Write a protein that binds this ligand. Structure first.
Ligand SMILES: *C(=O)[C@@H]([C@@H]1NC(C(=O)O)=C(S[C@H]2CN[C@@H](C(=O)N(C)C)C2)[C@@H]1C)[C@@H](C)O
Length: 242
């Protein structure tokens, strides 16, 4: 059943010379696909995917709001795409680190550690460095843990206000094709051991049904960033999720 599906998806991953897993959660049922299934319960830095929880915490605790404009004071950033004023929602789409760092600072280390622990995100360790704990360690999370987190978000089942959850969900819309809405958040940790690529989110099918996913793969600098999107869409289509 899944073995035919997984044979095809295994091949997708082989064809593009990487080791990756794709975790799918429909409701409470979790299946693994890809050519590196052991990745599914291996911890990795969440990188840019932590922005989902960052936003939830920041909004919940009233440190910002969806309308606030975070102004670019003019300093050069790691990507030219980030060099403009933006809202929290626009920063999510662009993975604009400086905006989310300013947010994390507003929250403070101790509120951050408290919230991360209350929610139970990954190993729930943030250490003492308020602006890179989700990039270089100690914070670590499995792909299975990521899919459960985003599934809960999609079902408005996380322990945050309903409206905060709706607001963060609205920041996460990637793609809308043939009535299927694709929500998600990419992440690419470029400066660590083996580079880590993420793409974590869910599909809202036309009848309202939600199928959540977490792609996690080894990245190499020669890859286009869109290889994560490619492997996701090809797999979802092959699974008839889209
Ligand atoms: C988060 O993991 C890093 C962040 N994420 C990320 C990516 O997932 O590709 C880039 S965002 C920036 C680089 N390319 C442009 C883009 O949005 N995409 C290719 C999707 C803008 C960057 C590495 C963050 C920790 O730096």
């Amino acid at each position: 059943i899944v073995q035919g599906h997984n044979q095809v998806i295994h091949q997708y991953f082989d064809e593009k010379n990487t080791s990756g897993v794709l975790v799918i959660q429909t409701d409470k049922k979790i299946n693994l696909y890809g050519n590196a299934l052991s990745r599914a319960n291996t911890e990795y830095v969440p990188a840019s995917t932590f922005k989902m929880l960052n936003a939830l915490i920041g909004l919940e605790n009233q440190k910002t709001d969806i309308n606030e404009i975070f102004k670019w004071k003019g300093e050069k950033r790691s990507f030219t795409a980030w060099e403009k004023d933006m809202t929290l929602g626009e920063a999510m789409k662009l993975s604009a680190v400086p905006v989310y760092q300013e947010l994390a600072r507003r929250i403070g280390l101790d509120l951050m550690q408290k919230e991360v622990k209350r929610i139970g995100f990954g190993n729930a360790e943030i250490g003492q460095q308020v602006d890179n704990f989700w990039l270089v360690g100690p914070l670590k999370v499995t792909p299975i843990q990521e899919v459960e987190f985003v599934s809960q978000l999609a079902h408005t089942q996380l322990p945050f206000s309903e409206k905060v959850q709706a607001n963060v969900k609205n920041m996460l819309l990637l793609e809308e094709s043939n009535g299927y809405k694709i929500f998600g958040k990419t992440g690419w940790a470029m400066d660590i051991k083996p580079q880590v690529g993420w793409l974590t989110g869910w599909v809202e099918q036309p009848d309202g049904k939600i199928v959540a996913f977490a792609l996690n793969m080894e990245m190499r600098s020669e890859m286009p960033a869109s290889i994560r999107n490619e492997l996701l869409m090809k797999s979802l289509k092959q699974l008839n999720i889209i």
